[PDB]
Amino acid sequence: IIEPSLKALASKFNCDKMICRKCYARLPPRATNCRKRKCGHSNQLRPKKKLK
Amino acid sequence: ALKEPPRDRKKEKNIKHNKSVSLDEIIEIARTMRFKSFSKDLKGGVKEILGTAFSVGCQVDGKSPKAISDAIEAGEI
Amino acid sequence: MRYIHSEETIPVPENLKVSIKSRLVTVEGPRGKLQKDLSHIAVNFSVVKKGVIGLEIHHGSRKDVAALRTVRTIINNMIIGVTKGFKYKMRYVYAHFPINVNVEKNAETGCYEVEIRNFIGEKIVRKVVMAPGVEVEISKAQKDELILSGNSLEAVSQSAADIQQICKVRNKDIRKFLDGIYVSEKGNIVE
Amino acid sequence: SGNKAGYFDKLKGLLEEYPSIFVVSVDNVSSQQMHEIRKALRGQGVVLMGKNTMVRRALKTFMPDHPEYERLLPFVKGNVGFVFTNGDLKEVREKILSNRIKAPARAGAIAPVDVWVPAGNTGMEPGKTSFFQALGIPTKIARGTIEITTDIKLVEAGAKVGPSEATLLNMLNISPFTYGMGIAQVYDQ
RNA sequence: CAUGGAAGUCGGAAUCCGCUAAGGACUGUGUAACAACUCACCUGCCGAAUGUACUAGCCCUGAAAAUGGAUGGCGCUCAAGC
Lengths: 52, 77, 191, 189
Ligand SMILES: [Mg+2]
Ligand SMILES: [Mg+2]
Ligand SMILES: [Mg+2]
Ligand SMILES: [Mg+2]
Ligand SMILES: [Mg+2]
Ligand SMILES: [Mg+2]
Ligand SMILES: [Mg+2]
Ligand SMILES: [Mg+2]
Ligand SMILES: [Zn+2]
Fold this sequence. Notes:
4 chains, RNA-binding
């Protein structure tokens, strides 16, 4: 098992992210536009699917 | 307490909205016990609050509990 | 649209000295000395008052003015580091296989080296060497901590990121395998 | 901003009718504390506070109704209130000073003075001894009651109280904070 | 109303008033049920702007073919481009 606080710390770096719908890039949780140039800085973002 | 007749058992499983009561000084008389526990500038504020407090009962006949309290035309006591 | 005058100010406490020459900044105080080169930015440095440094840009564009605030905080970071230092903390996160580290001392030079063993039960021994001026310690306050401290924020932070980026899980669901070493707190040595 | 209009006429009407105005400096005091003093002083005097009146008292200075209003302009800085009353200065000097509350710590609150627990018997259930062992306090259970044999320093004056100690301060009924009404200088007294 | 138990927060149906500058018969978290906690709303600090929706200029994404290669060539960036 993993201590509850440690599991929260690790999840911040690889679980709470936004995903672009055009180039599958990882984005910050509060982002509004993709940062990559090959997708044209698109603003079609979706949350990262949770584990359940 | 001012409810339609008795609240007989095994009758509250279905809708129990048959609690209509009359709107008169009987409800106003019961307001004197509280006596405006929190300020309210004596029973004058409490009477308006208590009158509209029974909003489910919809007062008596055509008159509505909100209209009586909203219309400041009745005597203080 | 070009802006005529954009200005910022940096206060200087009465403990250290700073000197700028040919856009090369040298900051020296009680805890040491640092240098930074800013020859790639067109900025005019000046002495506003007895203990205040001013900097400004004339007839700049929107893109050029943006760098003005970036320069100010970088120099402020240098002042903080020489009088208060910096301090980072890291934690170990494992489910089954314990992670073993060995922070051996100076290797005939100022550099520290960190050895990481038994990551998710692998036989690699993986080695990272820290930048000079950075000291790595095993904490005694509580279990599973790495403490990094130094004078410059850029060196301390980049070295800490080196350790985090080296412990990676491949060909697995990373939402389930949360193994690794992560940073958890940032602050100064003093207070 | 319907209530905004109601503030303008209310402020100007009440200031002129009462010749005596008293300024009160209340800061970080629980709302219930003002509730009781409002009810206690309900019969005599009305207390009313709002946002700073940058031009609302300055408007009272323009007309010659009170040449002394413009003398009181610079005294307002922030979170300073006014009291409208008709009573004597001496009777209202300490009237609003009642009900000083005992504010507990908030997990890190700076204690102005060193706080000490005198030796004695807590008298509480001995299942809570784990809280004492967190700070490493030497405690002996006597007759089912936790007893502090030797005084242990909690936190130095001016230092942040530990989160466990701050919670521990609640059941011991000891805290460094006492919140009460603040009296500011009024009318160059 | 509901009830081994539901005190805003299983659920069903209503939405008033006191005190105020402001705090909802409440958006969540949470208790067997209370509590505790968050939000909403208002106040203290600062010093002049801020928010949403549309129009069209240059530039960028959309833009994958077979011998080595063509604004005519070199080269050009407050142009030697529009
Ligand atoms: Mg697989
Ligand atoms: Mg093109
Ligand atoms: Mg060509
Ligand atoms: Mg071409
Ligand atoms: Mg030509
Ligand atoms: Mg030209
Ligand atoms: Mg030509
Ligand atoms: Mg031309
Ligand atoms: Zn993208």
